[PDB]
Amino acid sequence: MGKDYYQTLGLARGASDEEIKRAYRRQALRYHPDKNKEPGAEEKFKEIAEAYDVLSDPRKREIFDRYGEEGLKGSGPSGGSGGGANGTSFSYTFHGDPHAMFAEFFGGRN
């Protein structure tokens, strides 16, 4: 339905940076390799990692915040052109994967 980052974190849209980190920890633990091994859920984890990605990274934070998810995937206000993609397909920037951030922050623990 909706790829609401806060709903994928599992908290209120008006939550705090700290709560976003903690909420993210729960979710990253939820889909941690040693906790959950399922195809598609691995992609859900990417979507959650993406959710946080922007919450941790001001560079996509403004974007998400400004327009939302569609303005980051390439289907928002200029949907179809995806910024400069023009005719090129493009998923969420899962390259930006704060499982390295997570591994650094919490290390896959509580």
Among 84, 88, 108, 98, residue whose Cα is nearest residue 54: 98
| Contact (Cβ atoms closer than 8 angstroms) between residue 27 and residue 9 | yes
Per the document, the length of the chain is 110
Look up tokens 């023009």; give the residue: 86
CA–CA separation, 50 vs 94, rounded Å?
Answer: 6
What domain range includes position 58?
A: 5-106
CB-side exposure of 47: number of CA atoms within 13 Å? 16
Number of domains forming the structure of the chain: 1
**CATH number of the domain residue 92 falls in:** 1.10.287.110
